[PDB]
A paper describes a structure:
CI-MPR has four non-adjacent CRDs (domains 3, 5, 9, and 15), each with distinctive phosphomonoester and phosphodiester glycan preferences. We now report the crystal structures of the N-terminal five domains of human CI-MPR, revealing the orientation of two CRDs (domains 3 and 5) with respect to each other at pH 5.5 and 7.0.
Crystallization screening of human CI-MPR domains 1–5 protein in the presence of 10-mM M6P resulted in two conditions yielding diffraction quality crystals. Although we were surprised that the domain-3 binding pocket did not contain M6P at pH 7.0 conditions, the presence of the N-linked glycan near the binding site of domain 5 could perturb conformational equilibria between substructures that stabilize a domain arrangement most favorable for crystallographic packing. The flexibility of domain 4 was also recently demonstrated in the cryo-EM structures published by Wang et al. at the time of this paper’s submission. Comparing their bovine domains 4–14 structure at pH 7.4 in the presence of IGF2 with our human domains 1–5 structure at pH 5.5 or 7.0 shows domain 4 rotated ~180°. Another possibility is that PPT1 binding to domain 3 causes a rearrangement of domains such that the binding site of domain 5 is no longer accessible by ligand.
Numbering used by the authors: 8 to 83, 88 to 296, 301 to 311, 316 to 335, 341 to 351, 354 to 467, 476 to 496, 512 to 533, ...
Amino acid sequence: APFPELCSYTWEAVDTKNNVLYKINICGSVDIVQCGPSSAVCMHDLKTRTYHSVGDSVLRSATRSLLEFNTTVSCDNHRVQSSIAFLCGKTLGTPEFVTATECVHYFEWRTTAACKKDIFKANKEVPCYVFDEELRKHDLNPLIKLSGAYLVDDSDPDTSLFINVCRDIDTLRDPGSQLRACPPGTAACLVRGHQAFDVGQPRDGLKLVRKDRLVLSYVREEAGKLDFCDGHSPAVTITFVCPSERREGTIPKLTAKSNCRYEIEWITEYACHRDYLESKTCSLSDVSIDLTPLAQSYISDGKEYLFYLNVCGETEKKQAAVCQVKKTSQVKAAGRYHNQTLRYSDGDLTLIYFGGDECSSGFQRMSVINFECNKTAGNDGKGTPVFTGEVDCTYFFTWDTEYACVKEKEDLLCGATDGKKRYDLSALVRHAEPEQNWEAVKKHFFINICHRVLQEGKARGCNLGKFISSPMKEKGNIQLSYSDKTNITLVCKPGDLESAPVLRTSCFYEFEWHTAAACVLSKTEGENCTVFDSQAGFSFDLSPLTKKNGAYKVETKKYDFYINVCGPVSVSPCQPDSGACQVAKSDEKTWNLGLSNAKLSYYDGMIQLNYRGGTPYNNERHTPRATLITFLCDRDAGVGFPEYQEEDNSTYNFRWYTSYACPEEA
Ligand SMILES: *[C@@H]1O[C@H](CO)[C@@H](O[C@@H]2O[C@H](CO)[C@@H](O[C@@H]3O[C@H](CO)[C@@H](O)[C@H](O[C@H]4O[C@H](CO)[C@@H](O)[C@H](O)[C@@H]4O)[C@@H]3O)[C@H](O)[C@H]2NC(C)=O)[C@H](O)[C@H]1NC(C)=O
C-alpha cells in the first residue's frame, strides 16, 4: 500500500473550488515547517495562508483500495483523517481531490503503482505534472507512451533521437522496431544506423521554470563511456510549451545537440492548463460526456453486505442511488440525489452521492464512484460497479464502462512526416493579417491553411468551411481534409510560394495547389547573416539584430554573457573578435566563447549560429570553446532577447525567440 514508485516525492492535489492545495507524501513527511513534522497529508489555504496537517505519517493504515492517514487532533466524527482510494492505472498519475468535510479528506489516484502485475510498470517513471501560480494544473500524462517513442525532428539523416515523456522507453513486443537495440531504462535513445545509445534516464519530475514553460531533464551520469561526447555527461532537456497564435504546435524539435547535451522544444496542447469540470448532473460540457446511458439493478458484493446502485434515475425510503443490505435484511441508504456531483478532473471521471443515512458514528453515509474507461467492458459496454473499500462510512466503487471513454485530442499540427522526411505548410498560413486570404480560380472561393478565414472580404466567421484535422502525406503529395467537406491536394513545386490553389471539382470539394510548402524540409546554410532556403521560396536575414558596438547582455547567477549576432562583441574585458563572451561576476575573469561569424543555418523554423574560435580548455585535446545560438520563431516576440541554456560547465547554448525567424521575411 505504501507503493515504492510513489515514495520520495511530495505530490499535490487541489480543491479547485474552495481554493485549497493539498501536499501528499505517502512514505515520509512533507518537508514543510508550517504543518509540523511527520505530516503525510498537509492541507493549506490560499485564503488564509494557514497550513493545517490532515494526515500523519505514523498513523497510517490500509483497507482494500484505501490508504488512510489519521491524525490525533479533533474535529467533531471526532478526529481529522485523510484517505486515498487507489486504482490501477496506465501511468504513474496524480492524486485528485474528491471531497472534504471538517473531518475527512478524500482523494483518488489512478496509478501503475497499485497494479498487481509488474508488466504495467515502467522501469522508472517520474511525476509528470505541475501547478502554476494560479493553481491550474499542467499534466503531460497523456503524452506518455506505453510502447515506443517519439522521433525528435533533426536535420541529420544518419542519426535519430527518440524520447519518451516522464519514463523510459518500452522496447518490448515490437522486435522489428529500430528501438529494440536500445538499452533498458532509457528515456532518450540515440541511434546511429545500428548501435543505439542511452543519452538520458528519468530522474526528477516535471518543473515549471518561468510561469508557463514545463521543463524535464534526463541525465545519465552513472555510465562512464563518453565515446563520442568527449568528456561530457550525456543529457536531454525538453521544454514543453503551450500553443498560441504567437507559436503554434510542432513535433519535438532538436534545438541543440553538441557534446551530447541535447535540447528539445516541443509546442503541444497537452502543456496547457487542465480544466476541472463539475456539475450536479449525469452530463458534463473542451469536449462532452454523458452518463445517462448507464441508468439501466446494479449490485456489488461488499464486506458482509450487498450494495444496490441505481445511478442517474430511480428505475421505475426511495430517493437513494445506492443502498446497503446486510447479507440480516436491514438496509441503509448510502447516497441520494439530494446533491450528486459529477467531476471530470484531469482525466478522472468521479461521481459522489452526498445523501445517506447517518451511521452509528457521527458520519452521514456517502458514496464515491470512480469511473474508468473500458470500451470492451462487459454488460454490453455498460459494465458493473465493484465495491473497493469503505472508511468512516464513505463507500468507494470503481466502474469500468465505455461511456467513460471520452478522451479527445485536438493538437492539430500544420505539418506531416514520413519516416524522417518532414513537411510543413506554415508558409501558406495567413493569420489575422494585413495580408488577404488565398483565392482559388461563398462569393469567390477563399482558402486558408490550418487557420480560420480572414475577414478581408468576410466569409463566415465560424459557405461551409470546415477547418479541422491535420494534413497527411497522400499518394506522393500532401492532402488536407477539411471536414464538416474539402480535400486539398498540395504538390511540391520547388521555389514557388507565390501561386494559388485551383478549381478541379464542385457537398464534396477538391482543390489542387502547387507549392514549395509541399516540399520535404531540408537544412540550408548562408553567409553575410542571411540564409536562403531554395526549395522553399525565401531567405531569412538576421542582420538587423547585429549591434555595431556590440553587446547583448545575458545575466545568470555567476556570469554575465555578452553576445552579438553575426558580428563581434565590444565590452570592457572581452577580446574584440569574439561573438560571445563569458565574464565571472565575482572575479571578472573572462572566457572567449568563440569568434564571431555570419554563417546562418536553417532547418524547420530554427536558425543557428555557431561561434567556434574560443579560449581553449585545460586539456591535451586543443579543444576550443564554442557557442550556439538557436533562433526560434515567435511571431509577436519582436527582436527578442537571448537566453542562456543551463547545461554543464562547458556548453554555451543560447535560445532567442524572435519574429525574424518566422515565415514572414525576405
Ligand atoms: C558579404 O559582404 C562583403 C562586403 O562587405 C563581401 O565581400 C565582397 O564579396 C563580393 C563577392 O565575394 C565581392 O564582389 C562583388 O561586388 C560586386 C559589386 O560590384 C557584385 O556585383 C558581386 O556579385 C557577384 O560576386 C562574385 C564575383 O565574381 C560572384 O561570384 C557572385 O556570384 C556574385 O554574382 C559581389 O558583391 C566584393 O568585392 C567583396 N568586397 C570586398 C571589399 O572585397 C562578401 O563576399 C559578402 N558575402 C557574400 C556576397 O556571400
